Amino acid sequence: QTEGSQCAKTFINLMTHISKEQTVQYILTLVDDTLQENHQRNTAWSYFLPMLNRQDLFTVHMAARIIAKLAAWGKELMEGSDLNYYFNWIKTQLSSQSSQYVQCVAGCLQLMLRVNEYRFAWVEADGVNCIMGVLSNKCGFQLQYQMIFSVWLLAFSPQMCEHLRRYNIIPVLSDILQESVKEKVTRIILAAFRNFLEKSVERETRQEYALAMIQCKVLKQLENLEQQKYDDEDISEDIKFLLEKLGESVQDLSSFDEYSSELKSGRLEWSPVHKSEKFWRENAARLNEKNYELLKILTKLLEVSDDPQVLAVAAHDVGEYVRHYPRGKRVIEQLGGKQLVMNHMHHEDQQVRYNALLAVQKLMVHNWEY
């Protein structure tokens, strides 16, 4: 039953001029099963696309499965110029208001986004928030598995990686990474984090790390995943790969000049360096080597400005300086920051008073004679 070369146009003309749409669907589904393992049969694909998506349920998703496989096969059959008018045509079909057919449409998008040059042409015309709309709550059990595979497919190109940074999709996937239900989307989202981090040629790898890998529950969640004993060696290797990179960048985010860059420029954001024990132990005399009033410049920012969130970082950093340097308590008494921390302990903010309570109690922990 092999050796089929001719009669392709005869099946094409019979497919268009057939009033029995159910028999035309059987003609289309038999053509889909035949082309599932065969070669190319896109001017006819430009003709078959207009008759498709026309008031039929089963014929819509099957032609979409056929035309994307026609797009996923053939070097000369690459019709990305015509697929640009076809991807936006199926983009209204890619809306999240349908039922029981978007999963095959996402699988059709999985074959469509498998291309390289068509993907960069897609993402400009995509509006990828619709894929983030699928990442929004619409019960994505297997739909997010198709969606995270689409994000892993778009994370190949580094030029597409830079355009993908104009969203919070890295932290929007960390919430989906915190799901961990079907034990396969956890495998897909872990390598997609490895794809976004490793395959990006820029200094923005830390910009993709401070967003979701550092300042979210990602490095902590990957600690328990390494404690897990899943049989997949690819996910087991990607777990160690993401832990080594993010563990290096968190250590690289605490070098006492980045803390100085946070101090001198200001705004005192809660970073991992302020909570790291290695940052406070190594940079103990870094405040004293920097003309010690620079440590009082942290105190001048704490005393003068109110800052109900930013002074909370100022309280914990001042106590870590006193904990790693008992002679700095005399320097804090020289600057008078102890009375400033005592008055800031009576602030109306809960986290500011809790941080000042741990700092002021650490300020009198050593108790030299007055």
Place this chain on the structure above:
Amino acid sequence: EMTLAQLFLQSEAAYCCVSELGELGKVQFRDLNPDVNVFQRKFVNEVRRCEEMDRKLRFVEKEIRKANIPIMDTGENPEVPFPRDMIDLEA
């Protein structure tokens, strides 16, 4: 009049089935892999995580009495926390 009749699971329903099965109380789970040590029972790392929270709870129930604080009871059989909620508990 009992039967050792087999029952299949799928490991996406391994918690929420068994927990509601353990919310009934008619089941007699029988170990049929006796040729194994007390470790490597597929979940030794996570039962110590419950045991670490057990060690923290047996410690925090001691210090709550030395300061002599009255204890709320509100006695009712609660909902069993999912492994999704488990990582949020250790925080």
Place this chain on the structure above:
Amino acid sequence: SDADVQKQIKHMMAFIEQEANEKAEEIDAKAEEEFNIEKGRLVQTQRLKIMEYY
């Protein structure tokens, strides 16, 4: 009810094909880094020797 043997063929075979397809499709779509990138390596070796005769 004798359909328990059919319920095994009903939905436990569905767990066979999801690991058959969606784990091999993760492998089959890994040609963007194992077929396109590895092609990008050897074309530099052809452009290393074309920048003498040009």
